[PDB]
Amino acid sequence: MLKPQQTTTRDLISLDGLWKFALASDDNNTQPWTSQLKTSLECPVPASYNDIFADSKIHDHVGWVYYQRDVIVPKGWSEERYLVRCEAATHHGRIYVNGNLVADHVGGYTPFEADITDLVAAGEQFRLTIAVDNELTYQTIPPGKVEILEATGKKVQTYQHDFYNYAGLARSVWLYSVPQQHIQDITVRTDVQGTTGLIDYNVVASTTQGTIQVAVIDEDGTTVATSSGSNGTIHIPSVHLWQPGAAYLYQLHASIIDSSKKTIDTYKLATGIRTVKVQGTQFLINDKPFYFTGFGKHEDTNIRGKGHDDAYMVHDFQLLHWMGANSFRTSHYPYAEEVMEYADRQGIVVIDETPAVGLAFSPATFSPDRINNKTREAHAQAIRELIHRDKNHPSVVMWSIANDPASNEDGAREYFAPLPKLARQLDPTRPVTFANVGLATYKADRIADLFDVLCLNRYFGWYTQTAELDEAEAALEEELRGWTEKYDKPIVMTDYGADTVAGLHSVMVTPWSEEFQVEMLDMYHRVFDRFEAMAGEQVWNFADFQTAVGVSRVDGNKKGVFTRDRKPKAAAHLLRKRWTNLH
């Protein structure tokens, strides 16, 4: 259902705070959800659990963990319907109401919930256990594989993506209420015809006893259009368009109305009116060419891992404005909903991406014993959930289906083909892409024609023609010539950068130095400006972030333009110089 909010007809209780916490063990205490959890450990809830406790065993845990607390259902919610929702459980979440299992959810970055109305009475207290598993298989969405170390028998988790596999309840948890007759979902699609905006709306409600009313109210509070019935099309004369650096949001009020025109339910949905179209080599927002600038990001901060953080979000956006970035990509999984809402308000453009990284074992990637049909089912599901949650965001401008898949290999085409079709059928208003890895050159890639925009990740400077920028430059523009020659589509570089340690400086060409980072980005830009077909540049990455451990990762990925704590490297100042002065 829709993201809960408080209305005149709905109440909303945060369940954030400290919960009791335990790992699964191998004792008789199988089934921790059947009684009061016995632990001194408390884990804060919007957070990944891994780095919270300064304990290796928790950090390295493979398998299930348990969060628990008591909840009291407000006494005045008899006569109403009520749910427990996890905005996200990374990767597999189970909800229990006193020992009854009431939801079982497999994706790691989208919402799930359970209607507990008939299990617990208003004003009753219950024990809420939420079990979350972190295990990845070749069928989970980021896929991976658990192994056992021979000598010690320690379980270990392998996977093919960079960022660390933080787990837990990294986003907030809620108790909320709706009326018996309630709104469940709303879809809004926005076109523009001259100066007139139009909203195609569709409301889905638990009942059609009593009817649906809509009002559309502008930023000044004046009702600018009205409509009746669950589905319809509204015109808005002289619209204020939502624009890439000037957000404008109307506010769509969907209500359920009884025989007496008495409101029995209501929901307020923020709406930006704007259009995305791809025309040849151009990416058009409101019929005008747009050029992405900004980053691929990560949900990653010092202690709470991937947990949502209001402050770092608002700061992160301020830093985007400060350097004149107009966009980012939700690199390698959907971010928290609040980020998308905030982007809507900040006038920031978003490439919104599924959790589908790691579909590459370079052993044939797309085969029965690796990334097969059952993985595609999970991928299809990821696509549906992402789209079902983020479809109404004006800031969301395109769907990214995957990141660095092995789109050069046999089987890749048979695997991906249905997916861009599924997306476009779920949401026909946005174009679809994926992020292409170096191995799938314009010659070798077998999947690119099935997409509306091409996104490329490239590290010519760093990984291959190492510190040889003149060699990287030639190879970069060879590759881009190939792509422009072969496809009539917009090109966005979604990765390009260099690991860089704050304070490490050199007047020579030296990788891992701030000078090198600047020089490489600056070369890439020179090359970008040589190609009419370029529609965007998003540096990798906004900020240093944590990775699986490895002799080649210096306490994480240090390709950030800011440090993990958001201090700017020289690179940051270079981008600021370029993005505040370019078109």
Added chain:
Amino acid sequence: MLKPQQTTTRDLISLDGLWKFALASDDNNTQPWTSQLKTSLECPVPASYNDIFADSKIHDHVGWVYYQRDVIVPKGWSEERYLVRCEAATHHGRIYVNGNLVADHVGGYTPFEADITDLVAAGEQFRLTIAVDNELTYQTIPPGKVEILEATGKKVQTYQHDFYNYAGLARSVWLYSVPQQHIQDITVRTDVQGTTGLIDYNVVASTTQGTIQVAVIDEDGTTVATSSGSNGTIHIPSVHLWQPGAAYLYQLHASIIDSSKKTIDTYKLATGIRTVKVQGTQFLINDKPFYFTGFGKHEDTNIRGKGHDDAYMVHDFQLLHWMGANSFRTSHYPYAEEVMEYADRQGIVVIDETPAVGLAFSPATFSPDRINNKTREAHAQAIRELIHRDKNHPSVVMWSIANDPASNEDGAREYFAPLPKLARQLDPTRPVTFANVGLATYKADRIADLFDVLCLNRYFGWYTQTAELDEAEAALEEELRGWTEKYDKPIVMTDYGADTVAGLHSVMVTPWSEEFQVEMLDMYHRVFDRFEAMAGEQVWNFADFQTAVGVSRVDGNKKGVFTRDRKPKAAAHLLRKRWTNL
């Protein structure tokens, strides 16, 4: 009123989130709370606003700021009373409901609230504006003075303390409900007769029609004792005590009961049965001698300033447990209430401290034109609000009235005298202290005898000009001798350490190196261990933190044993060695 909770009779709504934010300005919008703020800025609400926006004007701003958002009172609060509460607005907060002022509060680190029951009806939406001011004066409890830079006209805030003057709503904001008859306060006081535990309670409730019941439930869910009446003494045979090693917490449920046997209001107060006592030079918890190990801390993290953060809190306590630290002090303001609850559960011991730092201009500090009796009122007020909120925490084992006052100057004894009497009077169950500065030597100080425990801050700087260890050692020992000859009280060292940059190393004796910090702590310990009267050692500081700009401050205070982002310097390992053993 008591820290609000959700019960069967009470509802609690978090108002944290992003709020509209504006700086005050000198335009005809002289009153932003009378209408929707159309600013595009949004500030997150458990946070200080200063480093959040990446904006100078906002960071350096002196004066009021406005937070704003709409709220809806739930439909079902009809028969109910409801309030808006700020846990804290630093330093001066105002709450507005649609153009109307309904609360005005002055301290920066304790809660305030307003009964809005009669202004807004159940199911109504209203505009909530909260004004927060950051100006310090000579009468604000951390005192200060606003000044004008002559060449630029720029407004600037002076003060005498280290930590940066972060402001805003650094703590959570709430809408909550309470029945017409409700409990408003509870005092518990715990003591021991043999193996039987004693709980004196007093419950203050809005009306006396229909009685009060108390149940005391143990960690297994067993009701272990009951009582009737608004106040009384409950006996807990074979009590499990709250100990520094090992928290045990009973759960006391105070209720109001109607004519029938029907619960009208209820409230769940965690209580740990424990005594604190000073005897000669010994600090006793449950009759056995106690030695404080741990830190002076601060509420300081990278972006959110002093904003409370559950993650950093849990981690910071794991690091304490990791290095075997058993205590910390709330230098230099009461910390979030949730930290004190968490301290109760973690078995960690707390010296709880007021905002009264910076009462020192080293011109005469204690005089009619400086820190005066009007200031003393704010100070008394600060003691009152702190003790009222933290009185029931078993973790809180001592009140610290001030940090680094000029306790050596004329006027200082006459200013301070009322204050420890006031504290002991509002809480007779704990001892009172203050953290003494290096100027106020055993000779010079004229306040110390008025307190129950002596806490010394003795950075080596007080003792040596050129970072010479043997020089520092001789002077620290001389001074500690003075204190132990002249007072029969426990001594706790509450500040010692060295500015230290992570990664700066030297095989020599070099200040600002990880080695120097190690050697200095270690030398201090050797000196402390020579003195029986020592009851404690808390290093300054737990972690690196932000300060006002000073060419002597390297983007803040680097005396942390951890970095701002909680990485250990060598000193952390050295402390871990000492505290995990003896």
